[PDB]
Design a protein around this ligand. Structure first.
Ligand SMILES: Nc1nc2c(ncn2[C@@H]2O[C@H](COP(=O)(O)OP(=O)(O)OP(=O)(O)O)[C@@H](O)[C@H]2O)c(=O)[nH]1
Lengths: 1111, 48
DNA sequence: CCTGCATCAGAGCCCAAAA
DNA sequence: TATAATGGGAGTCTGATGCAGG
RNA sequence: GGGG
């Protein structure tokens, strides 16, 4: 069908590569494709250059190299291996005493490599590293809350690279310095820098009472060396103030370009703010034997000038996105790399003392264990390294562009308040105002705006078009927040004739504040409305019509859309759904021009102009982290002529290259018999019949056979006391055959384990003797099927020890994996949502004969209750339906861009053209207006919907332009007493499906210490009946019900055993006994040397252990 | 006022011990109790 | 006598919780 | 069981209460 | 990080 696009906005630049924030960050850190001599000092390179040379003997760093991966990406995922490259480093050993030089290339372990789409493979699982927002290093000045006329200057370096500093000015009048939460007079530190009373008086003095308050005579009564010793006694009480020891402490804390690192952004922000230029990233220097100041005096100078009200001095807003920067993958990994390198150096210095000061090379001197652990620690356990969200291609694309304020070096949950969670004015065009979690994390986790990119310093930049005179150039400038506030920025929709601003009054911003301005005053202009919102928000058509709280739900839920076998793109798109599939890397494109030689289910072979017969294998039914099927399908035919960049295969949840998160269904908006109540949804059985909303899902099962002190676990088809009916679908070896239907209780992999000293009790001995069957040496441990799961066995992997290429963790003979698939039809309790935030569970599936239908016999698909619209204020879904109605009959799909879209009149033109096909067909087919259509028209003119005094066709078209049609109830045949809104809507099936969530337990596993039921469905747990639930039972006064919850249904052991026996014998359950978790409480208080005594009414002790604990 | 206040707080601890029958030197441990083992278990998990 | 000032103990529920 | 070796490395915000101090 |  035809695709009609609305909107007048010409976007001068396309969206940037969307995963570039990941790819570019790590490529810059490793520089693997750069020749060593040409590397800039950044990332991995910078870490080596910082840690070396290592002093005593001197070990010096030459260069590093990265090898190729031992195994390819697919292979790593299979074998539970990390995708990584071997790292080597060339080191030269120098003897500071002798002259000796031994040089060798030492192996430092492996480093994980990033794939093409911006993710990692860590132990077989695909992972994402989330960027971290934090306060930029630099020098800031904030108002002191206590004294309304004074200020604090804070010098903050990069995280873990130095202390926080506070320069409060105390009530006594002297300027104080705060380091590691301890305070002293700042004048003392100034003298150590070699400052004299003259320098401070002549430099500053202009502020009469402030500069004199810093002056303290006792401090001046000593040369720079004595003042250094004096300060050290303040910071480290009890440590003897040896001159080399004091220098070492203060140097490492202040001047050392190893223990103190301002940022590269810190240097720029400091140089720019104080109007000085920094020679390095440290606050001071050690030069010609004494200390020479860099930062401290300019920072003191700015503070006094600010307190006095000198022009050009302002306080800094700490949530401004110019003073807040992003820490990307490379930077996070490099920080952990730097820690691991410094630890290895501890091993080097300590080994340069023990064992002979001569017979050592660099290869024996280096133990790489500290480095390997730090990198492995970061990737396998950091709280920024997350399990990839790959439910559908958009899930992972969004995951990679997220920004977290949490994690190692940032806010905690308990540690976080309003200023940080707010939407700052500088978020415009940089961080999406919509896409954030609802609940406790609101505002801490956000998403990168679509046109934003992170610069080399770590500040988020956004594009704007230059405007010279009144003419808008095509030159685009990416701006930081600090630089953006200088200019006057017009809105992207301001009218244009050609390249000229066509309005006499334009809508613009100056420092985020909205302002009306004449075309003479316009310096820049927005590139597009798209630049303000995240990628998910940009996928919501008619967004200009949706309340923000609901738009949020629309964004977040597209992440949760399950790939459907029949998946289709929405009939109303925003025009981004093409780009998302392409940047995600889910689909497949042609490298150069060529002709398709072969097309298969498994592969596509293309013959290019070059003559090379490139073969593209297709990924078929691979199981993602969330168990949705990632599978690619061929879109071309043998001999098809393709150009460069044309589609070859469609990925999951994509249709002919457009993002398909759901299906397009015909919807009626109307109550239906209370099956619509409070957001529930009623659907037509026609949807299951034609396999709409069916999705494939795969669950993975695994079992190990290991060596025990009692003998080997063996995976075998021979399992004690089981009938042949039970083993039928098992192969020779005890593994289920590929292509079998397995249901709950069925054996997947047979296994036997050797019986413990529980070697059968005499009760079992006599029973076994009666039947004349020896009690077997092994017991049945077979892997089976959990309650509620099962499907078709599609694959088996078996890995033993002593087979090529495989070695398991110690003690493990063999590992078997069984992949089981299921086709899931939509059912009652599965969850649906559209892009505007209407979400609900399927409560009823009616047979097609009950569904409301159009006069021409077509039944509707979904019935949504109108009560969900007005309080929610998400109207985009309404406009989406109307344009969807026209498209149903005209056979078209639309692109309506956000904020430059299809407007109401334009949709009306399209709706009228549809009516001709819905009606004109009928008038020609020899049918006139229906009797019931008149009855509804009667009711409609009482409503003011149609104008009185027109032919039925004239009135029906009037209703059709309001998006309403006559609807017949399939139960009665009578019309709905009014015209009903009907049209095509895009609705997705989300990841929350009852099959996954239904759970129940009679009795089951218990915890070790408490003897209470376990938690969670996978453990067959019991439900938690918590403090508030007990209150509920208490307020009702249901004491025996409550007592059951506290005893027989949990940790009362004598009672719960006895209660079960009663139910199976038909007796009533016994009165409960003492709960075991109370006995634990008693014994734990005894371990604290407290005597807890249960007493009777006579004040005599009562023994709740029934004699077992007393001698 | 302050003299009467502190003698009270002290007198409350004294009276606490007096009524209860507890000896103050019991706030000092000679024998340290050890909690039963099943309450601090060493268990073999699935993997051995 | 009274007031700064520190050290301490608080910060919702249930479910997945992908180790 | 024997050259001599002699002092360490490292990280929010609220309200209530019992304390050394103009 | 995700559901109400
Ligand atoms: N205590 C608590 N409740 C939650 C949480 N998450 C979701 N809820 C529930 O979510 C529900 C929100 O329901 P709403 O749909 O906003 O109810 P409403 O007032 O009718 O709002 P509308 O439906 O838009 O009219 C509440 O009833 C909560 O019990 C949570 O994290 N904590």
């Amino acid at each position: 069908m035809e695709i009609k696009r609305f909107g007048r906005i010409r976007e001068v630049i396309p969206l940037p590569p969307l995963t570039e924030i990941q790819v570019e960050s790590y490529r810059r850190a490793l520089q693997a494709d750069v020749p060593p001599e040409k590397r800039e000092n950044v990332g991995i390179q910078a870490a080596f250059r910082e840690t070396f040379p290592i002093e005593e003997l001197v070990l010096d760093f030459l260069e590093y190299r990265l090898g190729e991966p031992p195994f390819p990406q697919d292979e790593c995922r299979e074998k539970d291996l990390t995708y990584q490259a071997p790292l080597y480093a060339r080191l030269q050993l120098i003897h500071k005493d002798t002259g000796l030089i031994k040089e060798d290339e030492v192996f430092l372990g492996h480093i994980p490599l990033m794939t093409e789409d911006g993710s990692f493979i860590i132990n077989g699982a695909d992972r994402v590293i989330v960027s971290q927002i934090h306060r930029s290093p630099g020098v800031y000045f904030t108002p002191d809350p206590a004294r309304p006329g004074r200020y604090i200057a804070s010098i903050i370096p990069l995280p873990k690279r130095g202390p926080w500093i506070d320069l409060e000015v105390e009530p006594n009048g002297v300027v104080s310095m705060k380091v590691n939460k301890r305070k002293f007079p700042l004048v003392l530190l100034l003298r150590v820098l070699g400052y004299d009373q003259e320098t401070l008086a002549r430099e500053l003095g202009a502020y009469g009472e402030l500069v004199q308050g810093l002056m303290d005579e006792s401090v001046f009564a000593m040369r720079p060396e004595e003042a250094l010793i004096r300060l050290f006694t303040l910071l480290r009480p009890g440590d003897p103030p040896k001159r080399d020891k004091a220098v070492a402490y203060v140097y490492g804390l202040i001047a050392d370009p190893r223990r103190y690192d301002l940022g590269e952004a810190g240097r720029y922000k400091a140089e720019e703010k104080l109007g000085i230029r920094l020679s390095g990233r440290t606050l001071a220097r050690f030069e010609d034997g004494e200390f020479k100041d860099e930062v401290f005096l300019p920072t003191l100078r700015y503070l006094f000038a600010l307190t006095a009200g000198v022009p050009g001095h302002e306080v800094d807003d700490i949530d401004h996105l110019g003073n807040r920067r992003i820490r990307t993958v490379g930077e996070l990994m490099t920080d952990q790399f730097r820690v691991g390198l410094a630890r290895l150096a501890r091993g080097v210095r300590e080994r340069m003392l023990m064992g002979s000061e001569d017979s050592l090379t660099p290869a024996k001197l280096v133990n790489s264990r500290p480095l390997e652990a730090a990198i492995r620690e970061f990737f396998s356990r950091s709280q920024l390294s997350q399990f990839k969200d790959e439910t559908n291609p958009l899930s992972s694309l969004r995951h990679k562009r997220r920004i977290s304020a949490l994690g190692p070096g940032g806010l905690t949950r308990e540690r976080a308040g309003f200023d940080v969670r707010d939407v700052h004015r500088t978020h415009y065009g940089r961080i999406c105002p919509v896409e954030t979690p609802e609940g406790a994390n609101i505002g801490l986790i956000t998403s990168l705006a679509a046109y934003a990119r992170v610069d080399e310093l770590g500040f988020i930049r956004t594009p704007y078009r230059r405007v010279v005179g009144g003419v808008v150039t095509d030159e685009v400038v990416y701006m930081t927040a600090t630089e953006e506030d200088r200019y006057t920025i017009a809105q992207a929709n301001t009218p244009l004739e050609g390249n000229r601003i066509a309005a006499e009054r334009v809508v613009a911003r100056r420092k985020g504040e909205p302002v009306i301005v004449s075309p003479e005053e316009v310096e820049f202009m927005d590139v597009s409305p798209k630049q303000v919102f995240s990628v998910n928000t940009n996928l919501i058509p008619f967004l200009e019509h949706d309340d923000a709280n609901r738009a949020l739900m629309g964004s977040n839920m597209q992440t949760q859309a399950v790939p459907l076998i029949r998946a289709q793109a929405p009939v109303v798109m925003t025009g981004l759904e093409e780009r998302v599939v392409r940047d995600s890397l889910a689909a497949l494109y042609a490298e150069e021009d060529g002709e398709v030689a072969k097309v298969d289910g498994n592969r596509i072979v293309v013959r290019y102009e070059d003559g090379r017969l490139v073969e593209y294998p297709l990924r078929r039914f691979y199981r993602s982290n969330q168990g949705t099927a990632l599978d690619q399908r061929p879109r071309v035919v043998v001999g098809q002529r393709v150009r460069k960049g044309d589609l070859l295969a469609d990925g999951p949840a994509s249709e002919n290259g457009f993002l398909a998160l759901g299906q397009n269904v015909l919807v009626a908006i109307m109550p239906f018999d209370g099956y619509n109540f409070e957001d529930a949804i009623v659907i037509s059985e026609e949807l299951l019949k034609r396999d709409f909303y069916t999705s494939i899902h795969i669950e993975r099962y695994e079992i190990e056979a290991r060596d025990t002190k009692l003998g080997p676990e063996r995976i075998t088809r021979d399992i004690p006391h089981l009938s042949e009916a039970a083993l039928r679908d098992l192969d020779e070896e005890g593994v289920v055959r590929i292509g079998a239907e397995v249901k709950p209780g069925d054996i997947l992999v047979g296994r036997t384990s050797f019986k413990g000293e529980s070697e059968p009790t005499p009760e079992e001995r006599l029973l076994r003797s009666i039947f004349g069957e020896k009690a077997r040496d092994v017991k049945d441990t077979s892997l089976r099927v959990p309650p509620g799961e099962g499907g078709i066995v599609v694959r088996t992997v078996r890995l033993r020890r002593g087979d090529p290429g495989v070695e398991l963790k110690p003690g493990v003979r063999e590992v078997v994996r069984v992949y089981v698939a299921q086709k899931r039809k939509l059912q009652v309790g599965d969850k649906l949502a559209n892009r505007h935030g209407n979400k609900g569970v399927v409560a009823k599936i009616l047979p097609v004969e009950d569904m409301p239908h159009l006069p021409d016999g077509t039944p509707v698909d979904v019935i949504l209750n109108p009560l969900g619209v007005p309080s929610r204020m998400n109207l985009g879904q309404i406009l989406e339906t109307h344009l969807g109605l026209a498209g149903y009959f005209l056979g078209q799909r639309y692109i309506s861009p956000i904020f430059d879209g299809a407007k109401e009149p334009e949709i009306k033109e399209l709706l009228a053209q549809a009516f001709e096909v819905y009606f004109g067909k009928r008038k020609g087919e020899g049918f006139g207006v229906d009797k019931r259509e008149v009855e509804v028209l009667r009711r409609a003119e009482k409503l003011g919907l149609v104008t009185p005094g027109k032919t039925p066709e004239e009135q029906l078209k009037e209703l059709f332009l309001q998006g309403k049609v006559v609807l017949y109830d399939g139960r009665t045949g009578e019309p709905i007493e009014g015209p009903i809104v009907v049209g095509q809507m895009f609705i997705m099936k989300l990841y929350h499906m009852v099959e996954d969530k239904m759970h129940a337990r009679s009795t089951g596993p218990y915890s070790l210490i408490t003897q209470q039921p376990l938690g969670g469905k996978a453990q067959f747990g019991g439900q938690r009946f918590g403090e508030m639930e007990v209150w509920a039972l208490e307020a009702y006064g249901a004491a025996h019900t409550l007592q059951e919850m506290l005893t027989l249904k949990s940790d009362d052991i004598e009672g719960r055993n006895a209660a079960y026996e009663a139910i199976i014998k038909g007796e009533d359950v016994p009165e409960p006994s003492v709960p075991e978790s109370f006995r634990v409480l008693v014994k734990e208080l005894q371990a604290l040397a407290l005597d807890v005594q249960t007493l009777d009414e006579k004040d005599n002790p009562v023994d709740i252990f029934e004699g077992l604990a007393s001698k | 006022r302050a003299r009467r206040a502190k003698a009270r707080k002290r007198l409350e601890v004294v009276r606490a011990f007096l009524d209860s029958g507890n000896r103050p030197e019991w706030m000092i441990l000679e024998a340290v109790p050890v909690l039963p083992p099943d309450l601090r278990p060493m268990v073999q998990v699935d993997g051995g």
